[PDB]
Amino acid sequence: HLATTWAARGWVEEEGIGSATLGRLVRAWPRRAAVVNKADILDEWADYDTLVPDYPLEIVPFAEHPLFLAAEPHQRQRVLTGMWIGYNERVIATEQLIAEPAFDLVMHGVFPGSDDPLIRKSVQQAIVDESFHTYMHMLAIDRTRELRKISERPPQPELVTYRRLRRVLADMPEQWERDIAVLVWGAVAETCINALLALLARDATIQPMHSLITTLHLRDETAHGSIVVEVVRELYARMNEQQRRALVRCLPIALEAFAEQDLSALLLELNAAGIRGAEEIVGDLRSTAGGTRLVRDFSGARKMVEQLGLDDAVD
Amino acid sequence: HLATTWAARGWVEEEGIGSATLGRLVRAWPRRAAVVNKADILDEWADYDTLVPDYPLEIVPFAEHPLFLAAEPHQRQRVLTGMWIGYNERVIATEQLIAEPAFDLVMHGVFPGSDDPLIRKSVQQAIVDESFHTYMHMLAIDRTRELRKISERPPQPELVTYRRLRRVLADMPEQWERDIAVLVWGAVAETCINALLALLARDATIQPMHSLITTLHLRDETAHGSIVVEVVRELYARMNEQQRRALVRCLPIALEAFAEQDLSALLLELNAAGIRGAEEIVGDLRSTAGGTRLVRDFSGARKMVEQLGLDDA
Ligand SMILES: [Mn+2]
Ligand SMILES: [Mn+2]
Ligand SMILES: [Mn+2]
Ligand SMILES: [Mn+2]
């Protein structure tokens, strides 16, 4: 774990990227960004109502499972609160294991076309944003831990999205190809993260600070998604054929990994609340259509695929 | 290189730190931070004067050397401009190689006492600020590249501060000791960075945007300085004596590394402007008292050593 910087890179003369969309999003950053405009997030305390749920039952895939219904109310609430907590751990782990390393590759100029100052300005702005999103979800976890008086929480499984990337990188002897898989996993998370946030952002039944922080995050990520389409558009145009083919292969696998329900996490949480028959809830879930999927809306990645001209090459 | 996150750590019950000073700094962040209040930095177009210099001759260690005085004015300005760039590059490299990796250790709960929610809050705020500081300095470099029409800049030497830390780590086979060295190099940067920034922040003769962004950065780093004193006080009180000893040993070498003039960078700059006898200018500098030292003022780290009650350097 040697630390790295791009500060020593220097530069040569390059042609500018011409992107109307990137220029607009980059100029709009100070007026859009949650870090600039909503930084005093949680700081305010609360009109806090303890009976308002942490997590919407509407999206708990086992809400109506007889073994979940047969548990005591406090066991069910604890699971629902644990799932709110795990949702935030997921988002943070996504920033840190998926999005950030992808942005870091761009900032280090690893792909032809990535040295462009407008690309760099847009990406570094997104990096500032992810550090603030991390800050927000960290505060949301802490607040919840206090208000719900959760003294202890066990170590969690590694972000499922990342376990998948890890397994693919293991079969990639060459740095070039690993750089592509990293970039692609990042691009997919950035174009689709809106879908994970929208599950809570527009939910009027849960704690107001829960729909609030996902709303604020979602508004930044609408821009990150568009930025990422433009950047990948430019980078993909300049890639060699080996890079291009790898990119196309990696997309559908990155997509699944981003959208996947971590059933090991779900089992851990049910067991944490002493839910009898927890294996059976989770076995039934594996066997349910859509049961292994947390995120269902791939529209962001669809637009990106369209914008790269890859409709017919990608499943 | 595996990416890492602290997101999956969970928690056990622990007693707050009740640091009132940290509580204050954390609460003041939205009203203080440059990211919040000066995000629009370097978007605005102002009356730009090409004749105003980029860097203060007064801090150029070979300002009055014969072989540099002899060279053409356009060579002397390019070196001055390149040193302003090198300065920003030094600031970014320090954030990324030195400050952030130390903050990252705290966030990862690698030291007893670091799991504290207030400590975590103060640090994650500072980590947001460093991303924004990187952003400002990056834009400052690009503005200069545009206005000074700088077509090319060669790759630069690795941050001297970090070349020193790398070499210390090379002899540390145990993680616990590497962590301490990383922490200490970071705490030193954070407490002494004002001295680096002040070199430009209060100078009235250089380009206004140069003194301005350094000034904005300086304002945030005052708070990070105090944040770091609190945090390191709390971690140090909770360290075992093995850790405690390593920290004490690391302090002096971190200070020297933080302050060092990069002569291999100064030589690169002089060669780039094609200055005649660059090798000699730099040789003479290496033979001079204080020749290898850029930052003279260490009062920031002085204050931290005081607060850990370690006045015996
Ligand atoms: Mn984000
Ligand atoms: Mn994002
Ligand atoms: Mn800084
Ligand atoms: Mn700092």
- Give the fraction of residues assigned to helices of chain A: 55-70%
CATH class of chain A: Mainly Alpha
Strand content of chain A: under 5%
CATH topology of chain A: Ribonucleotide Reductase, subunit A
The class by helix and strand makeup of chain A works out as mainly alpha
**How many discrete domains of chain A?**
1
Named once each, the bound ligands are:
manganese (II) ion
Please identify which CATH superfamily of chain A we are dealing with. Answer: Ribonucleotide Reductase, subunit A
Number of E-type strands of chain A: 0
- Element string of chain A (H = helix, E = strand): HHHHHHHHHHHH
Oligomer: homodimer
Catalytic activity (chain A): 4-aminobenzoate + AH2 + 2 O2 = 4-nitrobenzoate + A + 2 H2O
Keywords (chain A): Iron, Manganese, Metal-binding, Oxidoreductase
EC number (chain A): 1.14.99.68
InterPro entries (chain A): AurF/CmlI (IPR025859), Diiron_AurF (IPR054674), RNR-like (IPR012348)
Descriptive keywords:
homodimer; mainly alpha; Ribonucleotide Reductase, subunit A; 64% helix; 0% strand; binds manganese (II) ion; metal ion binding (chain A)
Characterize the structure shown.
The structure is a homodimer. The first copy, chain A, is mainly α. The first copy, chain A, is built from 12 helices and no strands. Chains A and B meet through helix 1, helix 4 and helix 5 of A and helix 2, helix 5 and helix 6 of B. The complex binds manganese (II) ion (4 copies). The PDB classes it as oxidoreductase. Keywords: oxidation of P-benzoic acid, oxidoreductase, N-oxygenase.
